[PDB]
Symmetry: C3
Subunit: 27 residues, 3 copies
């Protein structure tokens, strides 16, 4: 389906496993 909004919290998110995961996880 379509993807719901990510957290709105001053952090960047990427799409993984049908979820929003912090970009910083990967950096």
């Amino acid at each position: 389906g379509y993807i719901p909004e990510a957290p709105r919290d001053g952090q960047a998110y990427v799409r993984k496993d049908g979820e929003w995961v912090l970009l910083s996880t990967f950096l």
Copy 2:
């Protein structure tokens, strides 16, 4: 709600603050 399309412009985007932000911002 659901998220609208990001710019279609040859650049990658991540989701932040209910917006599409260039990935390159963080790299």
Copy 3:
């Protein structure tokens, strides 16, 4: 329009060119 789900496969994706592209492409 709204964006469809990314692959659900243990990898992170970013939005580019109206598509889901592996984050690892850029790292």
